[PDB]
Amino acid sequence: GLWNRLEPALAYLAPEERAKVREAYRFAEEAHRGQLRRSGEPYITHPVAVAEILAGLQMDADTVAAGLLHDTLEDCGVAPEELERRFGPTVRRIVEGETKVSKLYKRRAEDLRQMFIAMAEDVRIIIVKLADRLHNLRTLEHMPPEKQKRIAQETLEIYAPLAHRLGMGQLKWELEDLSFRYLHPEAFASLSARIQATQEARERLIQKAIHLLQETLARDELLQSQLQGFEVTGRPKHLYSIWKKMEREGKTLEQIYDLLAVRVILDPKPAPTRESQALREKQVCYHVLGLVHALWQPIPGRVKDYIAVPKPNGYQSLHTTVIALEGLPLEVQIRTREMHR
Ligand SMILES: Nc1nc2c(ncn2[C@@H]2O[C@H](COP(=O)(O)OP(=O)(O)O)[C@@H](OP(=O)(O)NP(=O)(O)O)[C@H]2O)c(=O)[nH]1
Ligand SMILES: Nc1ncnc2c1ncn2[C@@H]1O[C@H](COP(=O)(O)O)[C@@H](O)[C@H]1O
Ligand SMILES: [Mg+2]
Ligand SMILES: [Mg+2]
Ligand SMILES: [Mn+2]
Questions:
Q1: Whole-Å CA distances, 161 to 95, 157, 158, 164, 236
Q2: Is the C or the N end of the chain the one with fewer CB within 10 Å?
Q3: 8 Å CB contact between 318 and 289
């Protein structure tokens, strides 16, 4: 069934691992047979969509499998002993933990308390709860408008930061943005309608900018001579982070440069002495700034030199807001590998 949708995403797993995931889906589909969600949809769609979220993150075989089974214990005729017998103790461990920790669709102080108590078992239990939470938020239109606000708050306070700390930034932004939609819809609808383009169009522009910079840097002869390699990463600013700093700093949306930002992480070639290495570390950063300014037109008064004036948090990097692509303000950040975090 819905399996033919999940199967391609599981290409990264060994054949034996994929068979485990199919045996898990076949068991979940048998266990969730005849069950429905709040949306008229059969229950199996939920554990498959959670297993999809985990598979997109290239998660552990037992983790993907545990995502298909994460609900087979709550008021279900499945004994935890059967999961240990069939899928091992690791799958059983995660699944018990995700069931015991307040489940999917239910004070919230006790459910956030249990979230920590499961922290001793393995962050693996959480990961699944993060995938589950993301899917729940994606299908929050089938929830009373009160319950919608309870979930959104919890997500912003507990899960989005946990995703952040686990290094799952694409999970983090989506968790934040869906939470923002249901928590403050008036602010969400105002800001979203203002932003003419969708996240599809945003990521397309960022990748055009990344290609333009990557090819411009690789074509500079003198730079590549003092360089070992480089990395051009992008980001479109997400609605929650756009609205968060407008309130925090006081700037209008027109007064946000970050709406399309790009980082240039550079690792220089090795140097004989310790000093001629620290000198090579800087010479590269300003050389990129030049090339960047010759590629995209720089905006007046937007060069921020944190190499020469580091932030009290020890932050070193060169910043410049430019006019890139279809006449759009793009922020560029130039730093070395060492100046990175
Ligand atoms: N990853 C990272 N980046 C750091 C850090 N300190 C400063 N920055 C950079 O510096 C930026 C903050 O400083 P600034 O860019 O010099 O300030 P303005 O953009 O307001 O001119 C940061 O921007 P942001 O969080 O993506 N944008 P915000 O929503 O706050 O407007 C980031 O680009 C840091 O510790 N880590
Ligand atoms: N210029 C940039 N290019 C790529 N990623 C960035 C850039 N600036 C910030 N980020 C990343 O985006 C996150 C913060 O972005 P924000 O949505 O503005 O709060 C962090 O995880 C940063 O690593
Ligand atoms: Mg500023
Ligand atoms: Mg940032
Ligand atoms: Mn669930």
A1: 22, 7, 6, 5, 19
A2: C
A3: yes
Entry resolution (Å): 3.0
Active-site annotation holder among 7, 60, 74, 122: 74
**Considering 75, 110, 141, 249, which one is annotated as catalytic?**
75
Active site residue 176: no
Q: Does 241 sit in the ligand 1 pocket, CB within 6 Å?
A: yes
Domain ranges of the chain: 2-191, 194-336
Q: How many residues does the chain have?
A: 341
Which stretches of 88-146 are DSSP H helices? 89-100, 109-117, 123-138
Residue nearest to atom 17 of ligand 1 (CA): 304
CATH architecture entry for 194-336: 2-Layer Sandwich (3.30)
- Just give the CATH number of 2-191: 1.10.3210.10
230 contacts 269 by C-beta, under 8 angstroms:
no
> Which residues face 297 on adjacent strands?
323
108 lines ligand 1 (CB under 6 A): no
Helix axes 123-138, 61-69, angle to 10 degrees: 50
Side chain identity at 172, as an amino acid letter?
Answer: K
Known catalytic residue: 52?
A: no
Amino acid at the residue 157: E
Cβ neighbours of 45 (radius 10 Å): 18
Is any ligand 1 atom within 6 A of the Cβ of residue 319?
yes
Is the Cβ atom of 245 under 6 angstroms away from ligand 1? yes
Cα 330 to ligand 1 centre (Å): 14
Per DSSP, helices labelled H in 219-334 are 221-225, 239-249, 275-295
